[PDB]
Amino acid sequence: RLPKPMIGFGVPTEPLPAMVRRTLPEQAVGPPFFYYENVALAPKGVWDTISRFLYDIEPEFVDSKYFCAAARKRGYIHNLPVENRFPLFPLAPRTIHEALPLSKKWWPSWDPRTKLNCLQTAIGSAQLTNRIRKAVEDFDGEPPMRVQKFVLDQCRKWNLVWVGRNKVAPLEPDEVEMLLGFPKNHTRGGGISRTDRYKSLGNSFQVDTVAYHLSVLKDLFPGGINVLSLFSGIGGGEVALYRLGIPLNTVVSVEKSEVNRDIVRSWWEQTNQRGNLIHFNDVQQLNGDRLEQLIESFGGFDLVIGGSPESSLFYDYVRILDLVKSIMSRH
Amino acid sequence: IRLPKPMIGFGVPTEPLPAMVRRTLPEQAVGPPFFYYENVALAPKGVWDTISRFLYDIEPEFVDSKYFCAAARKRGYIHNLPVENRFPLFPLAPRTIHEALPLSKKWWPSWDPRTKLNCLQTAIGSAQLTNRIRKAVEDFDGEPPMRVQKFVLDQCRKWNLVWVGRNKVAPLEPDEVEMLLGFPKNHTRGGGISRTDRYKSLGNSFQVDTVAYHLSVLKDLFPGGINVLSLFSGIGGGEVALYRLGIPLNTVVSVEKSEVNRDIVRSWWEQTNQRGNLIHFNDVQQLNGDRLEQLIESFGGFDLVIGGSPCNESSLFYDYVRILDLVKSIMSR
Numbered sequence A: 001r002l003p004k005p006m007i008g009f010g011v012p013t014e015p016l017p018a019m020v021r022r023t024l025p026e027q028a029v030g031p032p033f034f035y036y037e038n039v040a041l042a043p044k045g046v047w048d049t050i051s052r053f054l055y056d057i058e059p060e061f062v063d064s065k066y067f068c069a070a071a072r073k074r075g076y077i078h079n080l081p082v083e084n085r086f087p088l089f090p091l092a093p094r095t096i097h098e099a100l101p102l103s104k105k106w107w108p109s110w111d112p113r114t115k116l117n118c119l120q121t122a123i124g125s126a127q128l129t130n131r132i133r134k135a136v137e138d139f140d141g142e143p144p145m146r147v148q149k150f151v152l153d154q155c156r157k158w159n160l161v162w163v164g165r166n167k168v169a170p171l172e173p174d175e176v177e178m179l180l181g182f183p184k185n186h187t188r189g190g191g192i193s194r195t196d197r198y199k200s201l202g203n204s205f206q207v208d209t210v211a212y213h214l215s216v217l218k219d220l221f222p223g224g225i226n227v228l229s230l231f232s233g234i235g236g237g238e239v240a241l242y243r244l245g246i247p248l249n250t251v252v253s254v255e256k257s258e259v260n261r262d263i264v265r266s267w268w269e270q271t272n273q274r275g276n277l278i279h280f281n282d283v284q285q286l287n288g289d290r291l292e293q294l295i296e297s298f299g300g301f302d303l304v305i306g307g308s309p310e311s312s313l314f315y316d317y318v319r320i321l322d323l324v325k326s327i328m329s330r331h
Numbered sequence B: 001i002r003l004p005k006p007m008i009g010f011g012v013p014t015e016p017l018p019a020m021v022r023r024t025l026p027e028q029a030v031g032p033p034f035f036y037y038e039n040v041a042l043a044p045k046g047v048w049d050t051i052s053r054f055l056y057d058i059e060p061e062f063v064d065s066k067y068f069c070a071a072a073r074k075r076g077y078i079h080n081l082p083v084e085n086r087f088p089l090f091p092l093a094p095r096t097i098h099e100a101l102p103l104s105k106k107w108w109p110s111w112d113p114r115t116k117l118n119c120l121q122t123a124i125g126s127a128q129l130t131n132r133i134r135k136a137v138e139d140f141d142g143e144p145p146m147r148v149q150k151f152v153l154d155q156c157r158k159w160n161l162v163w164v165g166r167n168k169v170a171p172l173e174p175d176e177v178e179m180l181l182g183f184p185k186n187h188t189r190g191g192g193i194s195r196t197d198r199y200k201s202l203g204n205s206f207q208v209d210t211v212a213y214h215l216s217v218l219k220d221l222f223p224g225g226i227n228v229l230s231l232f233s234g235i236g237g238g239e240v241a242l243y244r245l246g247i248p249l250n251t252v253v254s255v256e257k258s259e260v261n262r263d264i265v266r267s268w269w270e271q272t273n274q275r276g277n278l279i280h281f282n283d284v285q286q287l288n289g290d291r292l293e294q295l296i297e298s299f300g301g302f303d304l305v306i307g308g309s310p311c312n313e314s315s316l317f318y319d320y321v322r323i324l325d326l327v328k329s330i331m332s333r
């Protein structure tokens, strides 16, 4: 199934695994590079399917805990050079202590969490926190694993952290934004509600992880790149490239969520990007006719990137990848 | 749907549309290889939008087989073939019930106005139903109330029942079905193949005369024969069409899950005494870039990729699009 340590072809912080290199089908190679992500713990044959349609390339499984304080198991399918990768600096917090310095005066002896579980879209009610306190207000103890494993399992699933005496709380949006490697208040703005923030963050790249894989693009494109981002979310791929110091000449972003679109746009404006951000609402309108003239106007895409959301939407990733890949092959 | 009426596609032998050619295709769509994909005309909502989307936004050719034979059959064909200089397949299939069934005339009630059959199903009328219908008209001098006329007509239209005796209706025989679809006689007949198995594999096969009219433009294009990649090959409707068109089949890679269908095509292959090779796979899934490359390396590359819809699995269509993209990518080097 999945590997010893989910370190893919290697992580900066750890000793290399046995297989450090790959050879890949000459269909897979050539312009453009592509990068697809999906949840690692997937149902049967799902990864078989994804692989079959992506040139039978073997997916790279890495846990993002090797890059930050939050664990997150993903598979990545790409034709990127695996050699000469480098980690993204400024370096992200590796532990809860580093990520949340003030949380450690309140941290019980029996909570061994040095890493956070996967960050997700919904969040523990005020009730749960009040309840947990009630459970452990009996003090002087370490009270039995009934109470402990209850609290620990609840803290694990909701990512609850100690912020007071016998008191837990969900991660604030900007604590989440930082564990995922986004700018502070990246998702904050306009009409965006609190729960909208959490939802957008729940489904998004861990920027530090993604940056490590995309780092090999920097030496390859000193003049900048054109990016086609499918299912852009809150711009995780584009932020990784910007933090990597790779100029974004042109970016075509396909993104159905309005909130997600505002977030990316504001980011493009706040960072004072000088390239073009071109947006489309639905992936189903990137037809050949359009792609033809995008590529004609702004040159070919050097990278097409996307993550998994509708389960048939994956086939549109495949459909757009090769439309692009075919158009960019004309002798 | 956005279904045209009359449904004559890009032309039919009786209205071949000279002076009309198909508009220039997107550079992505144009061959080689030529591709040809079939699906039922009355698909559910959005299906054809999707199919067209994934095949270079090409407009499907909607055509009723009633313009080619005696049994109506509404299908959509999406392809990158030239339309100009098509020609009808000969020998010519029967256009009406009377021509298809010369001996049915003597038993045909004056009030049964059918001259054409309905879409050939995979399933068939029950001996009770016929028994009933016969029984139901044991009244003298026929012409009984419309209410009974309307009943039997509806049932005859539903199950494609034909008159075979005095007050006697019967389902079409397998070999009568094979005829209407344009296959050789007893094409599906073979050792061990059940009667029910025959009717089934037939009920969802290409109408050969219709398909041949579309593929006819390939004859002048490939005097030295073609290599064919046939996905969801069934009982070999696409191959039978090309053979009957007089186009030599040098290399055919047929992919078919059913063994009954496999044996039928193989039987045809050697009874026809074909010279070229027929290679069988059973899952589209086992057709990957590696294999496709070694296949093209061995046999020279495909001039035609042909496939029929296996569903109204629904995901199998994406395997067709996948395979088409690989083949197309490989040859383009």
Ligand SMILES: Nc1ncnc2c1ncn2[C@@H]1O[C@H](C[C@@H](N)CC[C@H](N)C(=O)O)[C@@H](O)[C@H]1O
Pocket (backbone or CB within 6 Å): A200, A203, A204, A205, A230, A231, A232, A233, A234, A235, A236, A237, A254, A255, A256, A257, A260, A281, A282, A283, A284, A306, A307, A308, A309, A310, A313
């Ligand atoms: N049907 C669709 N059409 C276009 N975009 C979509 C569709 N479904 C989801 N998306 C986008 O793809 C994203 C889904 C996520 N799996 C991707 C997250 C993204 N990688 C990020 O960095 O946040 C959402 O942010 C949506 O904006």
Ligand SMILES: Nc1ncnc2c1ncn2[C@@H]1O[C@H](C[C@@H](N)CC[C@H](N)C(=O)O)[C@@H](O)[C@H]1O
Pocket (backbone or CB within 6 Å): B201, B204, B205, B206, B231, B232, B233, B234, B235, B236, B237, B238, B255, B256, B257, B258, B261, B282, B283, B284, B285, B307, B308, B309, B310, B311, B313, B316
């Ligand atoms: N997943 C699959 N892989 C390979 N073959 C299949 C699969 N599903 C269905 N088939 C075969 O493909 C056919 C699907 C039909 N729509 C095609 C009919 C065929 N084109 C004909 O002319 O009669 C069936 O007869 C099946 O035997």
